[PDB]
Amino acid sequence: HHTDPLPRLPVPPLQQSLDHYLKALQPIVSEEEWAHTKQLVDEFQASGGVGERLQKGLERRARKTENWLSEWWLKTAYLQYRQPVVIYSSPGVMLPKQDFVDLQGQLRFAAKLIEGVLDFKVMIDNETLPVEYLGGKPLCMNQYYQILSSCRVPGPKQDTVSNFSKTKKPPTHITVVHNYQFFELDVYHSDGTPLTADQIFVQLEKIWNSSLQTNKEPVGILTSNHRNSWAKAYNTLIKDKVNRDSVRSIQKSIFTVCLDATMPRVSEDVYRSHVAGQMLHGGGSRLNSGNRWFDKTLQFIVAEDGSCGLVYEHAAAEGPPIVTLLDYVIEYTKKPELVRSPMVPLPMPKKLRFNITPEIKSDIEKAKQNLSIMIQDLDITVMVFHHFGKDFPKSEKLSPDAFIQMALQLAYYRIYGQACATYESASLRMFHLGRTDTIRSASMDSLTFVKAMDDSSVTEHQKVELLRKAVQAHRGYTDRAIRGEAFDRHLLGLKLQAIEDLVSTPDIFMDTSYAIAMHFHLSTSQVPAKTDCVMFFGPVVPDGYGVCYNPMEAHINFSLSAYNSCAETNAARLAHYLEKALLDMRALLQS
């Protein structure tokens, strides 16, 4: 017995997407660039033209696949993306600081966290995970079944992803890494029952004491390099039988727990921002960066000082499902243990050794150098907006997410003096195997709003009208995007369909306007969670920002990133303007 299958991802009508595209370009391209683009768009959609041919191609594809976009998206967005996954692909999450003060407290928490994941896994293994709903409609739960017991695998041309959860005899162990040393930890007894918290704690003590050495080679840091470099080093690494066995154990593990060293001197108010760095990239070659396996889909991180969080491989899922799993786990850690497994002898967790040769050492050194450059160029800040959360916008009958997005547009305009291509993730989970699509936060309504907000010749009454119009318009774009009515994925599809049809790239995609539209100076995402956490990721362009937030009832946790190589961007500065924009908007509405 089961409810009806989810609707299939739709292909939107050609003219609808093209009209929306032209409207989204208006505030971020010049008048002449727009005029030229309109010409190209009309050429593209002319009767009997290229556009209609590609459109029929996608409609055909939708009739022959479970989701016309799923395979293409996984391939183009992740598997064929060759930049390192660290910072540029794998999002990190920071949890509230834990109160443990000694090793006992640290390991008790790590054990509870582990037990929590195994509890969640009961639903994955039995396919009994409850279906989530949005606006009365069921959502696809496929992403949740890709998180555990999975791992990305480097390839010379493109990467692949392995999921061992439904094999003949699925893995029964996690992997724990401490001071760069990996250990295979069975978390189920011979009869298939769990280890309980007490038993896991006992095993973690053994692992801890078996890895006190701090001068081992950080083999794991190899996973942080450019995908072509890692594919090369990976092939070399697994030539040795022992190395291959160790790599296989790591790849097959349910998940990985990283027992981190405490970061450098605090340096005061920059504590939260530095911990975010620890969760996203590890902090450095001499830190915590080698205490990982970035190909692993799920890595939980627990440091000695109480700083905790996770970093996940992006090919498997989106932010919302990841933090939902996190919420479940954290909630579990707060409940009292009800049943302790019978006391029985426990084996010694197996240390996964690596035989290092000069070649491998050389690859390790190159990986350390590459990552150092990456980390030094990352500018990340975390800001807790304590003034209000979802409560205020709701009291004004405005969508909190749309309110926040318009505040960001205002902050950006106040710094730059112009609007910019902006991306906000939309979840397509109402559809079978749906992932994401784009919400275009920069619009003519948002532009009109930001231009009038600080104009002393405009009445307070008109500023309020323009503000509400921009917020409501954004919410409109949001709701349509979630219903599969946006246009960005559709345009990508038409582009990929042309490749499959052996036709040259249509002019609309080689147009200056499209380049501008796809160059997101602001790439954003709302990732709500019950736990007071925050997610973060690096910008998608050298001169852009990455902005992520978790709106709570009375406050909002924000994450903002930028690259130091671009002198025009600064995360802390944008954060400051964002804080004032939010406050100014509340002040205007409340008057």
Swiss-Prot record:
It comes from Homo sapiens. GO terms for cellular component: cytosol; endoplasmic reticulum; mitochondrial inner membrane; mitochondrion; peroxisomal matrix; peroxisome. One of its GO terms (biological process) is fatty acid beta-oxidation using acyl-CoA oxidase. This is Carnitine O-acetyltransferase. Its EC number is 2.3.1.137, 2.3.1.7. It is found in: Endoplasmic reticulum; Peroxisome; Mitochondrion inner membrane. It is an enzyme of class 2 (transferase). Gene3D superfamilies: Chloramphenicol acetyltransferase-like domain, Choline/Carnitine o-acyltransferase, domain 2. The keyword Membrane applies. It comes from the Eukaryota. GO terms for molecular function: acyl-CoA oxidase activity; carnitine O-acetyltransferase activity; carnitine O-octanoyltransferase activity. The gene is CRAT. CoA binds at K390, K394, S395, E396, K397, L398, S399, P400, D401, S427, R475, Q526. Belongs to the carnitine/choline acetyltransferase family. Monomer. (R)-carnitine binds at Y423, S425, T436. Catalyzes the reversible transfer of acyl groups from carnitine to coenzyme A (CoA) and regulates the acyl-CoA/CoA ratio. Also plays a crucial role in the transport of fatty acids for beta-oxidation. Responsible for the synthesis of short- and branched-chain acylcarnitines. Active towards some branched-chain amino acid oxidation pathway (BCAAO) intermediates. Trans-2-enoyl-CoAs and 2-methylacyl-CoAs are poor substrates. It is a peripheral membrane protein. The active site is at H314 (proton acceptor). It holds the Pfam family Carn_acyltransf. It is linked to Neurodegeneration with brain iron accumulation 8: A neurodegenerative disorder associated with iron accumulation, primarily in the basal ganglia. Disease onset is in early childhood. Clinical features include speech delay, progressive cerebellar ataxia, unbalanced gait, and loss of ambulation. NBIA8 transmission pattern is consistent with autosomal recessive inheritance.
